[PDB]
Amino acid sequence: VLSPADKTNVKAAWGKVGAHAGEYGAEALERMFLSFPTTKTYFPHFDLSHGSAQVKGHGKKVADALTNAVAHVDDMPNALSALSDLHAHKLRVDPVNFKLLSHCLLVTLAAHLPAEFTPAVHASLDKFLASVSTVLTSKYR
């Protein structure tokens, strides 16, 4: 589980993203669709072209949800509940895909935060996102 230092590293790094979080969400998804094309199977109704506005729009919905997880770092299972229902009952997304989203998020967080992406923080993020992904996947059956 997230240790104090983990929550500390996570808040510092997320805080530097600040305003740019919406554009990171989109760079994130974009990296995902390009490197792991199977993920697209879930977005056949979106336009997945470089720059698509449906992709930026969604990018922001995703970052906004990571921000609110940081904000409630100590109560994530109840803070992300709705999202946990949506992905399990309506969208029905295979859990392996979440580890690919997370990996592209680190790549994204790493290409914009050279000063801040140390080993320890890299270890605190990986843990955060895995913990985000577990909650979101928690009600599959």
Site residues (CB under 8 A) for another protein?
27, 30-31, 34-38, 41-42, 44, 88, 92-94, 96-97, 103-104, 106-108, 110-112, 114, 117-120, 122-123, 126, 140-141
Q: What is the CA radius of gyration of the chain?
A: 14
Contact predicate 43/7, CB 8 Å: no
Count of H-run helices and E-run strands, the chain: 7, 0
Contact predicate 46/55, CB 8 Å: yes
The option from ligand HEM, a copy of itself, another protein, none interacting with 52 (CB < 5 to 8 A, set by class) reads: none
Residue 20 marked in a binding site: no
The option from ligand HEM, a copy of itself, another protein, none interacting with 138 (CB < 5 to 8 A, set by class) reads: a copy of itself
Residue 89 marked in a binding site: no
d(CA 86, CA 74): 22
Kindly identify the residues of this chain, within the stretch 86-105, that bind ligand HEM according to CB under 6 A. 86-87, 91, 93, 97-98, 101
Instruction: Give me the residue label for tokens 């997880």.
Output: 69
Distance of CA 119 to the CA centre of its chain: 19
Q: Which residues are near a copy of itself by CB under 8 A?
A: 1, 123, 127, 138-139, 141
